[PDB]
Short mmCIF file of C-alpha atoms and ligand atoms in Angstrom, two decimals:
data_model
loop_
_atom_site.label_atom_id
_atom_site.label_comp_id
_atom_site.label_asym_id
_atom_site.label_seq_id
_atom_site.Cartn_x
_atom_site.Cartn_y
_atom_site.Cartn_z
CA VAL A 1 109.40 118.07 75.31
CA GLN A 2 107.71 121.68 75.50
CA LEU A 3 105.23 122.29 78.41
CA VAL A 4 102.79 125.22 77.90
CA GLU A 5 100.41 126.37 80.93
CA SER A 6 97.09 128.11 80.76
CA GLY A 7 94.44 129.39 83.26
CA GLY A 8 95.37 131.10 86.41
CA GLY A 9 95.13 134.94 86.81
CA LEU A 10 93.20 136.86 89.40
CA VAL A 11 90.67 135.79 91.85
CA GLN A 12 88.90 136.86 95.13
CA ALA A 13 89.91 135.07 98.44
CA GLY A 14 87.78 131.92 98.81
CA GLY A 15 87.30 131.49 95.13
CA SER A 16 88.77 128.91 92.84
CA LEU A 17 90.82 128.55 89.57
CA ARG A 18 92.08 125.78 87.36
CA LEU A 19 95.49 125.56 86.00
CA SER A 20 96.50 123.24 83.09
CA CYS A 21 99.68 122.21 81.37
CA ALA A 22 99.76 120.60 77.95
CA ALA A 23 102.86 118.77 76.79
CA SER A 24 104.28 118.22 73.21
CA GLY A 25 105.29 115.04 71.88
CA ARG A 26 103.88 111.36 72.29
CA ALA A 27 105.55 110.39 75.61
CA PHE A 28 103.26 111.89 78.18
CA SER A 29 101.94 108.71 79.63
CA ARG A 30 105.68 108.16 80.63
CA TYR A 31 105.65 111.14 82.78
CA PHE A 32 105.29 111.90 86.56
CA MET A 33 103.85 115.47 86.61
CA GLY A 34 104.26 118.14 89.27
CA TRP A 35 103.17 121.69 89.96
CA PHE A 36 105.29 124.02 91.92
CA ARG A 37 104.65 127.80 93.03
CA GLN A 38 106.97 130.52 93.66
CA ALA A 39 106.08 133.31 95.59
CA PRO A 40 107.64 136.95 95.91
CA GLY A 41 110.88 136.52 97.76
CA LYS A 42 110.80 132.46 98.13
CA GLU A 43 112.32 129.79 95.96
CA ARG A 44 110.13 127.47 94.00
CA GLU A 45 108.29 124.97 96.30
CA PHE A 46 106.47 121.83 95.60
CA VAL A 47 102.60 121.89 95.41
CA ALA A 48 101.15 118.46 93.87
CA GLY A 49 102.25 115.61 92.18
CA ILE A 50 100.68 112.85 89.96
CA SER A 51 101.75 109.50 88.81
CA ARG A 52 101.70 108.72 85.07
CA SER A 53 98.46 106.59 85.21
CA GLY A 54 96.80 109.14 87.89
CA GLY A 55 96.75 106.35 90.43
CA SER A 56 98.94 108.14 93.06
CA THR A 57 98.65 111.93 94.07
CA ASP A 58 100.73 113.93 96.31
CA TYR A 59 100.11 117.28 98.06
CA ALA A 60 102.39 119.51 99.92
CA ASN A 61 101.32 120.26 103.56
CA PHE A 62 99.76 123.65 102.87
CA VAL A 63 97.29 122.37 100.29
CA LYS A 64 94.81 120.93 103.06
CA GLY A 65 92.57 119.01 100.77
CA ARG A 66 91.89 122.44 98.76
CA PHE A 67 93.69 121.45 95.43
CA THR A 68 92.97 118.50 93.07
CA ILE A 69 95.66 117.32 90.65
CA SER A 70 94.51 115.26 87.74
CA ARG A 71 95.48 114.36 84.35
CA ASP A 72 94.12 113.17 80.97
CA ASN A 73 96.72 111.31 79.09
CA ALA A 74 94.65 111.45 75.85
CA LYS A 75 95.00 115.26 75.81
CA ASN A 76 98.69 115.23 77.12
CA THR A 77 97.44 117.56 79.88
CA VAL A 78 97.54 117.88 83.68
CA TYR A 79 95.50 120.03 85.76
CA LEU A 80 95.60 121.74 89.06
CA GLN A 81 92.01 122.54 90.42
CA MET A 82 92.54 125.09 93.25
CA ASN A 83 89.60 125.67 95.68
CA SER A 84 89.12 127.98 98.48
CA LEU A 85 92.14 130.25 97.64
CA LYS A 86 93.82 132.47 100.19
CA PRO A 87 95.89 135.40 99.52
CA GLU A 88 98.91 133.33 101.03
CA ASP A 89 98.36 131.28 97.62
CA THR A 90 99.52 134.14 95.40
CA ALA A 91 102.45 133.10 93.38
CA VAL A 92 103.78 132.13 90.11
CA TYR A 93 102.70 128.42 89.34
CA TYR A 94 104.81 126.17 87.20
CA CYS A 95 104.19 122.71 85.46
CA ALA A 96 107.07 120.17 85.51
CA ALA A 97 107.59 116.55 84.09
CA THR A 98 110.14 113.89 84.93
CA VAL A 99 110.14 110.69 83.23
CA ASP A 100 109.00 107.51 85.33
CA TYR A 101 111.75 105.11 83.82
CA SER A 102 111.19 102.28 86.59
CA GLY A 103 107.37 102.67 86.18
CA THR A 104 107.17 102.90 90.01
CA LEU A 105 107.51 106.62 90.80
CA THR A 106 104.93 107.61 93.16
CA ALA A 107 106.22 111.13 94.37
CA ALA A 108 108.72 113.56 93.22
CA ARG A 109 108.90 116.93 95.24
CA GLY A 110 112.42 118.46 94.59
CA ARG A 111 113.24 121.26 92.39
CA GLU A 112 116.18 118.94 90.93
CA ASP A 113 113.81 116.16 90.46
CA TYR A 114 112.21 117.49 87.17
CA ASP A 115 114.09 118.04 83.79
CA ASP A 116 111.20 120.12 81.87
CA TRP A 117 109.24 123.18 82.93
CA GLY A 118 106.20 124.94 81.99
CA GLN A 119 106.69 128.94 81.59
CA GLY A 120 104.98 129.78 84.82
CA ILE A 121 101.57 131.46 85.31
CA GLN A 122 100.71 134.32 87.87
CA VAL A 123 97.94 133.46 90.19
CA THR A 124 96.88 136.40 92.32
CA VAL A 125 94.21 136.03 95.26
CA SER A 126 93.03 139.28 96.56
CA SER A 127 91.97 140.02 99.94
CA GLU B 1 135.49 109.50 115.89
CA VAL B 2 139.22 108.61 115.38
CA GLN B 3 141.70 109.64 118.02
CA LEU B 4 144.32 112.19 116.53
CA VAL B 5 147.61 113.45 118.04
CA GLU B 6 149.20 116.45 116.43
CA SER B 7 152.70 117.79 117.04
CA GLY B 8 155.01 120.33 115.99
CA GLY B 9 153.88 124.06 115.18
CA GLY B 10 154.76 127.04 117.08
CA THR B 11 156.92 130.23 116.22
CA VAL B 12 159.34 130.32 113.46
CA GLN B 13 161.26 133.03 111.53
CA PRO B 14 160.29 134.05 108.18
CA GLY B 15 162.07 131.95 105.63
CA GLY B 16 162.35 129.20 108.18
CA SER B 17 160.94 125.87 108.24
CA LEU B 18 158.60 123.61 110.44
CA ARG B 19 157.26 120.01 110.43
CA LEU B 20 153.90 119.18 111.74
CA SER B 21 152.76 115.43 112.23
CA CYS B 22 149.46 114.07 112.76
CA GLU B 23 149.05 110.53 113.89
CA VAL B 24 145.77 108.61 113.98
CA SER B 25 146.01 105.85 116.50
CA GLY B 26 143.93 102.62 117.12
CA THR B 27 142.29 100.08 114.92
CA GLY B 28 139.20 98.88 113.42
CA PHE B 29 138.86 101.85 110.90
CA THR B 30 139.76 102.18 107.27
CA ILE B 31 141.29 105.54 106.24
CA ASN B 32 140.06 107.35 103.10
CA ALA B 33 142.05 110.53 103.82
CA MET B 34 144.79 112.14 105.88
CA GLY B 35 145.81 115.58 105.43
CA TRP B 36 146.27 119.33 106.98
CA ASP B 37 143.87 122.28 106.41
CA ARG B 38 144.54 125.61 108.03
CA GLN B 39 142.45 128.66 109.08
CA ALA B 40 143.73 132.16 109.26
CA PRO B 41 142.16 134.45 112.00
CA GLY B 42 139.64 136.12 109.61
CA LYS B 43 139.32 133.74 106.73
CA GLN B 44 137.64 130.39 106.10
CA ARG B 45 139.16 126.86 106.41
CA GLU B 46 141.19 125.79 103.46
CA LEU B 47 142.79 122.70 102.23
CA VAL B 48 146.77 122.68 102.76
CA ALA B 49 147.55 119.17 101.45
CA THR B 50 146.10 115.67 101.78
CA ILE B 51 146.78 112.13 101.12
CA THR B 52 143.88 109.86 100.02
CA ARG B 53 143.69 106.06 99.45
CA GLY B 54 145.90 104.86 96.85
CA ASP B 55 148.75 107.14 98.06
CA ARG B 56 147.26 110.02 95.71
CA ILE B 57 148.60 113.43 97.06
CA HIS B 58 146.62 116.77 96.56
CA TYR B 59 147.91 120.30 97.32
CA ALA B 60 146.48 123.67 97.52
CA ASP B 61 147.99 126.02 95.07
CA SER B 62 149.18 128.47 97.70
CA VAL B 63 151.65 125.86 99.06
CA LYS B 64 152.59 123.64 95.86
CA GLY B 65 156.38 123.80 95.71
CA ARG B 66 156.96 125.16 99.32
CA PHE B 67 155.00 122.41 101.56
CA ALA B 68 155.62 118.76 101.11
CA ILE B 69 153.02 116.04 102.68
CA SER B 70 154.17 112.46 103.23
CA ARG B 71 152.82 109.40 104.94
CA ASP B 72 154.88 107.45 107.40
CA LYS B 73 155.69 104.22 106.20
CA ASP B 74 155.28 102.07 109.58
CA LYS B 75 152.17 103.85 111.17
CA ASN B 76 149.28 105.99 110.14
CA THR B 77 150.90 109.38 110.36
CA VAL B 78 151.39 112.05 107.88
CA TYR B 79 153.90 114.75 108.00
CA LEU B 80 153.84 118.32 106.45
CA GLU B 81 157.05 119.92 105.85
CA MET B 82 156.67 123.59 105.67
CA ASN B 83 159.72 125.52 104.16
CA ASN B 84 160.38 129.12 103.16
CA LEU B 85 157.43 130.26 105.47
CA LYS B 86 156.18 133.65 105.19
CA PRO B 87 153.96 135.87 107.51
CA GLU B 88 150.84 135.07 105.49
CA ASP B 89 151.34 131.25 106.37
CA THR B 90 150.56 132.24 110.13
CA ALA B 91 147.31 130.19 110.76
CA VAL B 92 145.85 127.54 112.97
CA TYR B 93 146.86 124.10 111.27
CA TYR B 94 144.32 121.27 111.48
CA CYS B 95 144.87 117.41 110.98
CA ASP B 96 141.88 116.36 108.81
CA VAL B 97 141.17 112.52 108.68
CA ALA B 98 138.40 110.84 106.90
CA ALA B 99 137.81 107.17 108.07
CA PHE B 100 134.99 104.63 108.69
CA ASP B 101 134.46 101.70 111.00
CA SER B 102 135.68 98.70 108.86
CA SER B 103 132.79 96.56 110.20
CA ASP B 104 129.66 98.99 110.24
CA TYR B 105 130.86 102.00 107.93
CA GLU B 106 130.14 104.47 110.79
CA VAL B 107 131.69 107.71 109.61
CA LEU B 108 134.69 108.38 112.00
CA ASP B 109 136.06 111.72 110.36
CA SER B 110 137.63 114.06 112.51
CA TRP B 111 139.55 117.50 112.76
CA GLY B 112 142.53 117.77 114.95
CA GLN B 113 142.33 120.13 117.89
CA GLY B 114 144.52 122.57 115.78
CA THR B 115 148.05 123.64 116.12
CA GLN B 116 149.01 127.37 115.87
CA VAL B 117 151.91 128.28 113.45
CA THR B 118 153.11 131.97 113.80
CA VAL B 119 155.63 133.23 111.22
CA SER B 120 157.19 136.47 112.44
CA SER B 121 160.63 137.94 112.94
CA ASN C 1 110.56 104.84 121.56
CA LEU C 2 110.80 107.71 118.69
CA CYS C 3 112.92 106.29 115.60
CA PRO C 4 116.43 108.17 115.55
CA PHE C 5 115.98 109.71 111.81
CA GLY C 6 117.74 112.80 113.19
CA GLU C 7 120.93 110.64 113.81
CA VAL C 8 121.08 110.03 110.03
CA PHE C 9 119.58 113.11 108.28
CA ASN C 10 121.54 115.56 110.64
CA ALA C 11 124.69 113.61 111.00
CA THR C 12 127.72 116.03 111.08
CA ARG C 13 129.71 113.77 108.95
CA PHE C 14 128.56 111.37 105.80
CA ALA C 15 130.10 108.52 104.31
CA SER C 16 131.91 108.13 101.07
CA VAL C 17 129.47 106.54 98.59
CA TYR C 18 131.54 103.61 97.85
CA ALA C 19 131.66 102.94 101.57
CA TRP C 20 128.05 103.95 102.00
CA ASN C 21 126.51 103.75 105.50
CA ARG C 22 123.41 101.83 106.35
CA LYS C 23 121.55 102.43 109.49
CA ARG C 24 118.72 99.91 110.42
CA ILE C 25 115.61 101.60 111.88
CA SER C 26 113.69 99.16 114.25
CA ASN C 27 111.82 98.81 117.50
CA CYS C 28 110.47 102.37 117.44
CA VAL C 29 107.75 104.83 116.34
CA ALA C 30 108.41 106.53 113.20
CA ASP C 31 107.43 110.14 112.87
CA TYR C 32 107.89 111.13 109.11
CA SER C 33 106.76 114.74 109.84
CA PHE C 34 110.35 116.08 109.03
CA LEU C 35 109.88 114.95 105.38
CA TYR C 36 107.01 117.60 104.94
CA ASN C 37 109.06 120.74 105.85
CA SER C 38 114.69 122.19 102.34
CA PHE C 39 115.40 119.01 100.10
CA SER C 40 116.45 119.35 96.36
CA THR C 41 115.45 115.54 95.62
CA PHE C 42 112.50 113.71 97.24
CA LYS C 43 111.32 111.05 94.92
CA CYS C 44 109.44 107.91 96.12
CA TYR C 45 108.79 104.46 94.69
CA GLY C 46 105.74 102.19 95.56
CA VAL C 47 104.87 104.25 98.64
CA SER C 48 103.10 107.69 99.09
CA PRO C 49 104.95 109.86 101.64
CA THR C 50 102.05 111.49 103.31
CA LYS C 51 100.63 108.01 104.15
CA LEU C 52 103.89 106.85 106.04
CA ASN C 53 102.53 108.02 109.37
CA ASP C 54 99.72 105.38 109.01
CA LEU C 55 101.98 102.49 107.68
CA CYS C 56 103.85 99.64 109.20
CA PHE C 57 106.85 97.76 107.83
CA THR C 58 109.03 94.94 108.95
CA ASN C 59 112.26 96.66 108.12
CA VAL C 60 113.12 100.20 107.48
CA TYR C 61 116.86 101.16 106.31
CA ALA C 62 118.33 104.49 105.95
CA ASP C 63 121.36 104.52 103.61
CA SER C 64 123.53 107.70 103.34
CA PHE C 65 126.48 109.05 101.52
CA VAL C 66 127.81 112.11 99.41
CA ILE C 67 127.89 112.18 95.66
CA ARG C 68 127.89 115.11 93.10
CA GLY C 69 124.71 117.04 92.38
CA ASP C 70 124.50 115.69 88.84
CA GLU C 71 124.87 112.01 90.12
CA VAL C 72 121.58 112.30 92.26
CA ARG C 73 119.41 111.25 89.52
CA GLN C 74 121.38 107.86 89.37
CA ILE C 75 119.95 107.06 92.89
CA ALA C 76 116.83 105.39 91.57
CA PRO C 77 115.62 101.99 90.39
CA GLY C 78 116.80 101.14 86.89
CA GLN C 79 119.51 104.02 86.46
CA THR C 80 122.84 103.18 85.11
CA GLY C 81 126.08 105.26 85.38
CA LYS C 82 129.25 105.13 87.47
CA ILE C 83 127.42 105.60 90.75
CA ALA C 84 124.33 103.13 90.16
CA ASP C 85 126.58 100.54 88.56
CA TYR C 86 129.86 100.69 90.67
CA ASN C 87 128.90 102.27 93.98
CA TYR C 88 125.31 101.88 95.30
CA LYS C 89 122.43 100.41 93.43
CA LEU C 90 118.76 100.19 94.08
CA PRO C 91 116.60 97.03 93.08
CA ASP C 92 114.15 97.32 90.30
CA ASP C 93 111.45 96.79 92.88
CA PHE C 94 112.67 99.54 95.22
CA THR C 95 109.89 100.65 97.67
CA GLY C 96 110.95 103.66 99.43
CA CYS C 97 112.08 107.31 99.16
CA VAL C 98 115.34 109.00 98.01
CA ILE C 99 116.19 112.43 99.60
CA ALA C 100 119.05 114.81 98.73
CA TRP C 101 120.07 118.39 99.50
CA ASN C 102 122.99 120.59 98.24
CA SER C 103 125.78 120.34 100.97
CA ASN C 104 128.17 122.76 99.28
CA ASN C 105 128.49 124.93 102.56
CA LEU C 106 129.72 121.87 104.65
CA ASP C 107 131.24 119.44 102.26
CA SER C 108 133.46 121.78 100.09
CA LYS C 109 136.32 123.83 101.17
CA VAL C 110 138.64 126.48 99.64
CA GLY C 111 141.27 124.65 97.74
CA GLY C 112 139.28 121.49 97.38
CA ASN C 113 137.69 118.81 99.71
CA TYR C 114 139.38 115.40 98.67
CA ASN C 115 137.98 113.36 101.65
CA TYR C 116 134.96 112.00 99.61
CA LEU C 117 135.71 109.08 97.25
CA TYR C 118 133.77 106.96 94.75
CA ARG C 119 134.51 103.91 92.63
CA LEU C 120 135.23 104.95 88.89
CA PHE C 121 135.85 101.17 87.56
CA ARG C 122 134.58 97.76 88.31
CA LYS C 123 134.57 94.49 86.40
CA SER C 124 130.92 93.92 86.83
CA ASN C 125 127.79 95.90 88.07
CA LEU C 126 126.91 95.96 91.59
CA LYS C 127 124.02 93.90 92.72
CA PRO C 128 121.26 95.84 94.52
CA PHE C 129 122.39 97.00 97.92
CA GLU C 130 125.93 95.56 97.52
CA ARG C 131 129.00 97.26 98.79
CA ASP C 132 132.50 97.11 97.47
CA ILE C 133 135.44 98.41 99.33
CA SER C 134 138.20 96.59 97.63
CA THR C 135 141.12 98.45 96.11
CA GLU C 136 142.53 96.12 93.59
CA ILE C 137 144.10 97.57 90.52
CA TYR C 138 141.63 97.54 87.56
CA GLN C 139 142.35 96.03 84.47
CA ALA C 140 140.97 98.19 81.63
CA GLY C 141 142.92 96.79 78.76
CA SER C 142 144.06 93.35 77.38
CA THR C 143 147.22 93.31 79.35
CA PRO C 144 147.15 91.87 82.97
CA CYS C 145 148.01 94.43 85.69
CA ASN C 146 149.90 92.24 87.98
CA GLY C 147 148.71 94.45 90.86
CA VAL C 148 150.77 97.23 89.59
CA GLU C 149 149.40 100.66 88.09
CA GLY C 150 150.31 101.36 84.45
CA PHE C 151 148.80 102.02 81.05
CA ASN C 152 145.24 100.58 81.08
CA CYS C 153 145.80 99.75 84.86
CA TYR C 154 144.25 102.07 87.37
CA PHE C 155 143.43 102.38 91.04
CA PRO C 156 139.67 102.03 91.21
CA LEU C 157 138.85 104.95 93.58
CA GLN C 158 138.73 108.48 92.74
CA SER C 159 138.40 111.61 95.03
CA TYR C 160 135.62 114.22 94.12
CA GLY C 161 137.64 117.20 95.23
CA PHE C 162 134.68 119.54 96.08
CA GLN C 163 135.35 123.18 95.52
CA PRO C 164 133.03 125.96 96.57
CA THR C 165 133.28 127.58 93.27
CA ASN C 166 132.24 124.37 91.24
CA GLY C 167 129.30 124.64 89.21
CA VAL C 168 126.09 123.15 91.21
CA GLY C 169 126.14 120.03 89.08
CA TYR C 170 129.62 119.36 90.62
CA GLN C 171 128.78 120.38 94.20
CA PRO C 172 128.46 117.82 96.77
CA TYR C 173 125.03 116.67 97.78
CA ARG C 174 124.04 114.58 100.88
CA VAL C 175 121.75 111.57 100.17
CA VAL C 176 119.49 109.56 102.38
CA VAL C 177 117.76 106.52 100.87
CA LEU C 178 114.91 105.26 103.11
CA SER C 179 113.84 101.64 102.26
CA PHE C 180 110.34 100.47 103.56
CA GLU C 181 110.41 96.80 103.50
CA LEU C 182 106.98 94.62 103.95
CA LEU C 183 108.21 91.23 104.38
CA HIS C 184 106.65 87.87 105.34
CA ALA C 185 107.42 88.71 109.05
CA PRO C 186 105.66 90.89 111.61
CA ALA C 187 105.61 94.62 110.67
CA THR C 188 106.88 96.21 113.72
CA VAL C 189 108.20 99.90 112.32
CA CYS C 190 105.04 101.89 112.54
CA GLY C 191 104.15 105.54 112.26
CA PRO C 192 102.05 107.14 114.95
CA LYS C 193 98.78 105.98 113.19
C1 LIG D 1 117.27 117.87 111.55
O1 LIG D 1 117.37 119.12 112.25
C2 LIG D 1 116.54 120.09 111.93
C3 LIG D 1 116.93 121.39 112.61
O2 LIG D 1 117.04 121.40 114.07
C4 LIG D 1 115.35 119.38 112.25
O3 LIG D 1 114.27 120.59 111.90
C5 LIG D 1 113.15 121.16 112.85
O4 LIG D 1 112.14 120.46 113.43
C6 LIG D 1 111.37 120.90 114.53
C7 LIG D 1 110.45 119.85 115.04
O5 LIG D 1 110.28 118.95 114.01
C8 LIG D 1 110.66 122.15 113.84
O6 LIG D 1 110.02 122.76 114.90
C9 LIG D 1 111.71 123.16 113.22
O7 LIG D 1 111.06 124.00 112.60
C10 LIG D 1 112.63 122.46 112.28
N1 LIG D 1 113.68 123.35 111.63
C11 LIG D 1 113.80 123.32 110.46
C12 LIG D 1 114.90 124.31 109.98
O8 LIG D 1 113.43 122.50 109.71
C13 LIG D 1 114.92 118.38 111.68
O9 LIG D 1 113.54 117.74 112.13
C14 LIG D 1 115.98 117.19 111.90
N2 LIG D 1 115.68 116.08 111.08
C15 LIG D 1 115.11 114.89 111.50
C16 LIG D 1 115.16 113.73 110.47
O10 LIG D 1 115.04 114.80 112.79
CL1 LIG D 2 96.01 117.63 100.65
CL1 LIG D 3 94.58 109.49 81.86
CL1 LIG D 4 101.38 103.91 100.03
CL1 LIG D 5 133.36 92.23 89.82
CL1 LIG D 6 127.00 122.30 87.03
#
């Protein structure tokens, strides 16, 4: 399955951005979806996760209520709305998918928990 | 952790031989492995030889053919016969036991205190 | 007072998976903050990890052991494979979280660390949370083994043999499985709330 990201780019501190990630194929309602970020000089780290039905969300400790993850299964797309952006948020942002085989997955935060990745989009928050 | 007793070791002339022994005493635990590692003054710890459950013997490449490990047939002691010793075999040798409490699976693994082996004229 | 998760996660020694360790967590206040600060796997089933500090459970278990990196995916409800089938099995209705990290720096050694074992063969799959530490010879073919190894007759445990140059899928990973059980009984393992 191919994951393709859009959105992102440059923004002024305190502004907002929406990222999206569209999946190929017909299995998208099977997937737990995650967003990860990779900032200059650090490894990739979890940002947000959402269950296959959208019933459960999960946010890293640095989100602090600022970002919303959402999905539209009828468009094969997961979204990350990012508000009140800080320069600390500058990073390459990745989409990722993992199949919820048991139907009960409510969080997935490890780099090794996902098998398919989007290409990464640069997000830059300027002072 | 399990209580270990090591014996043997010390100084030997190059080409000579030494026998190390490592005894694990007591009861109430199940043994997964008993063996020897070694660590030379600069370098990291490496396997020498070990015996795992089922009497499976594993050797490091640097000792295969010169060292022999064996299990005592009447107690939980393993022996390392070191033959044809050479200066590079000089190291601290450590008994290395993996075991667990047979009732509550508490991990009891232990390194020995280490025994110096010095191969020099 | 504070629940001793540190004794589990930061234990210097971990169990072989076939002899996996269970620690029961009870009569204590559970601070889950350490989960949000590191791990290569962190999947939860039926529970939201950021809610744990406001939740109460009747039993909490922490199960721990070492497996290969490419086996961590078998520590999940519904999985199959030698580890899920023959060593450590989660129930379909598992509620809890599975946490793992690469432990190459502690659990491998030059020339190989053979101290960690797993069960390669079994006549039937484990039931959820079953532990098998038996060492009968496994009959893989039609001929009875009569307790002796031979063609088609195998000792059932195998050593991983972790070497620091193994590919990351074959390196050792330490795993902690946290079970949060909400039973028909008072729920006395709570977060700070
Ligand atoms: C296992 O040990 C680590 C290292 O001591 C603990 O992590 C530290 O926790 C304190 C207080 O929570 C923090 O101030 C440090 O920043 C942490 N250090 C690191 C490197 O993360 C960890 O809490 C322990 N695990 C458990 C379950 O108690
Ligand atoms: Cl948040
Ligand atoms: Cl939807
Ligand atoms: Cl929950
Ligand atoms: Cl069986
Ligand atoms: Cl690999």
